Amino acid sequence: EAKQGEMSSRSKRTGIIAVKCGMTALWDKWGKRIPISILWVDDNIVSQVKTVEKEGIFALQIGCGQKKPKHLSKAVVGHFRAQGVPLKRKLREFPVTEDALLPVGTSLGVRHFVPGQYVDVTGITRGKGFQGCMKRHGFSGMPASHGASLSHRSGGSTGQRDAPGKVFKGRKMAGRMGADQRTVKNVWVYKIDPARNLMWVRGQVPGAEGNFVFIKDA
């Protein structure tokens, strides 16, 4: 994947921040079915161009969504106003090269992404709460017809006077699993719309039933 979008030979173009709308099922011309995800880009715009000259690093501050003065907390109302930039639901920074540097106040959209090529998403995933092992890590469990008060628990660290009561950094039942996990080197974008600025992807994009995803690798 090269010679597309808008840049020179080699750089990283900025990322674009969208919302997981759901999944559906398309078909191809060769009569085969692929699952589909629709990522909705809410008129994302540039709100701060970060600078090695002044600040120290090369970053485009893309805002997404829409918000209202009754919903922002004044310390950011001031930010948006000083930038003179329409209000957005969530901010997000990207580090991109010296080229691929945008003017304050240029909106982005899905035609930034050439179809047929790949992306990398980052979606703060769907935690499940204070789960335990055997689901958190796919541990096994002792039988259900012989052993008591263990039917679903775990084992015990290596342990004896040597490795003296020193459980190394092991694997225990633990709190939730909501985090940001990329799906590296995604599979090509089916289609993106001129209006409505959606985009369909072959499937399995992390993030909630809405409100969370980022995209890069292009």
Add this chain to the structure above:
Amino acid sequence: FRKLGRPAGHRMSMLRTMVSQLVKHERIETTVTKAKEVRRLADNMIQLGKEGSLSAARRAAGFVRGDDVLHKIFTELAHRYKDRAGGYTRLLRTRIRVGDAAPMAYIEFIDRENELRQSKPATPQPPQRVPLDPWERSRLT
């Protein structure tokens, strides 16, 4: 959504008594996170007073009980909300005191003699319109 921590038979057979008493009397003082639950059966038993047919009456015969609060509904609550489209209870949070830190709540109907928060007037709904998705409100400042 609430379980209240009760076997799903006993839970109903309590909620029935609660809505029925809420209709016999006009106000009750109950634990809030359970008032937040009769908040639904009361209205779905007002709707049957509004419909009043034989079908939607013999159905209410199952959900309300104790006394002829059945007739109380059908006769007065209809005629006092023949217009009010939705929202037939107030569910205020009195937290009076208990000995168990359990909150407490007044729950009672709306257009009576002495209500608690002197209501707004029952206005008929406006009729539906087609939804659109412009997403054109910049909200800049």
Add this chain to the structure above:
Amino acid sequence: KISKHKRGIRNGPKALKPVPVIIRCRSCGRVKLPHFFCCSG
């Protein structure tokens, strides 16, 4: 076995925080946290 040091350290961070904003029925007597049904008028 474990002494005042640890006992105080454990019972401390479970300290009582004075309650924030607290309102009274201007004339109807009672005092209350917000969002209560003290009174009527």
Add this chain to the structure above:
Amino acid sequence: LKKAVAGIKRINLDGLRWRVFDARGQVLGRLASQISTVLQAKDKPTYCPNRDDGDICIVLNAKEIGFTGRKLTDKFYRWHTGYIGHLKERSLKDQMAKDPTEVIRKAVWRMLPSNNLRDDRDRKLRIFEGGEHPFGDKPLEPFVMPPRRVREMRP
């Protein structure tokens, strides 16, 4: 970055002395012990061992530095990351192509006396692997190593 390299001289006592150790590119340990003294204030008369009066000593041009023998590719630095198994190891060639400051900083750190004023002494030490330093406008005393270098020579 003038800021991020000017350090925390806003924290020490300043009012004693600024001194400059510029290794001419000769030898680690014989730079080092001299430092571990000057940067411990045991070299002036008014010493008292319950305090820090370490003078500012500033080393210069650690790129031009010489370590004899062939330890360069033999003596690594070893460190243990807690996680079972691991032992992250790095030779001195790696270390010197990375940052030839860390080398001597760590060395004098180990030489300094093993008490909790050690960190509170290194808080009085700064390094540039050039000759270029922003600590010039302050009273600058360049320093000379002892006149004790006979330097035995071999065939």
Add this chain to the structure above:
Amino acid sequence: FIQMGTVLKVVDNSGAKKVMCIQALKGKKGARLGDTIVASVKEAMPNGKVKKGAVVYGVVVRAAMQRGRVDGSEVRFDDNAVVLVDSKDKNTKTDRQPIGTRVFGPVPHELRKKKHLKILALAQHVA
């Protein structure tokens, strides 16, 4: 999943009638529809090419495990049945070669994709 201990029907016209799985050459749970299984004959006519108590390979043709084609479509037969192939006791050249003369009972044409075109050609009619 057709796995160890399963007891599935022979559906070619070789000697054996009932064949009891012991393996799945390319699974770790049972083998889904269309994959070679290893198994031990359990009953035969006295005169066929195969005699009871003899490890023999096989290919799956009917499995109560639902399976979907790539078309999103899904199919699931009633019972488990397989057709024999001569064991590896013959070299790699004969890989995927049957034993009998004619199977009988509907067959899925995922055998083609799975490269079992040999048994496929004999099929009554491919589902």
Add this chain to the structure above:
RNA sequence: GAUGACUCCCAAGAGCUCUUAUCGACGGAGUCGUUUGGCACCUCGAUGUCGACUCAUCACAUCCUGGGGUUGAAGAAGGUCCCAAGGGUUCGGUUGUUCGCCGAUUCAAGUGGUACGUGAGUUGGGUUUAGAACGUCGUGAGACAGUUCGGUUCCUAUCUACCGUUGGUGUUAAAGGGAGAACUGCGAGGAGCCAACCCUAGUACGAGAGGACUGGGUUGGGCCAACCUAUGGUGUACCGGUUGUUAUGCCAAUAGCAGCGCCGGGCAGCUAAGUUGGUAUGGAAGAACUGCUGCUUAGCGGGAAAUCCUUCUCUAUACAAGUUCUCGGAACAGGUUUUAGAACAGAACUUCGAUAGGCGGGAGGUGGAAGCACCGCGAGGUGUGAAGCCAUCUCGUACUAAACGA
């Protein structure tokens, strides 16, 4: 450290020729602490003993993958040896088995350490209590390092360790100095698998038989991360069928109860049997191993699934405590929820409002409501009628509860 395993020394003889490919007789040299052991130093006012399950971890003296030397290496399969621990190391049959034999497989079915790992994690079959019996010994009481049957497994976690979640605090500063975002990422973790098949190619090699080297391509398994739109499973406040009984006088239509009473269904949610997605490139240093210079001191270059950077994750209590924007009645706090959730936390909404409920409209599930009309004596059927209802989902509407005068 005797025996033990391994290495090394020497080299009679075997290897048709040949000592050293491969071995290697006699006799020695050492390394390790794993079998057998020796000693009796810690523990008998207690250090719970075999095997299995779970959970791993290290060493490398290497089973495969990974590179090279060499071969009695034509090619291919090998042999042996050097480097190498990154990732792997299967199921089942009899036995309690560890071991081991076996059958079926794989790239391989590694050797030890870790109190012969692991009972305040589990099991408790052996074995070391009481019963009982067989053979043998004892002249009996009884024993058996022989055999078989049965023979209570305690602990509410203080601390260290460890998985996670948070509150305070320190951080020059200007407002009493209080904050909200947005990074950078000193540095820590994570991921590194393999087969088949096709091609190049019946090409090099070989008399064919046979059968390459390498690089590209596909198809699979394992491992891991993520997602339920479909399919399955469930779906306990849904729809319908249905039995026993009690009530609403009875018909009608409902209710309670039978641990959804039992059936057939079942959306959203959750899960995997399903679906995705990864198993990389680039860069440096550099292993034996290999070459060339040298100038006898040295010089550099290839050179391994290895190490370190690039991806992913975590991070400024990173104490040299970092940088940018903005707020200053600013941040909180409380209330309705939540795609988030044990409390806390995050995120949404807080009346110039869609935050939840409610009501209307659909969607989505069940599957022909009641009353009425007909047909038949009836059980019952047909029409009125995709009727009737509604757990969820969307969409309209502030009708309810989320302003605030502390």
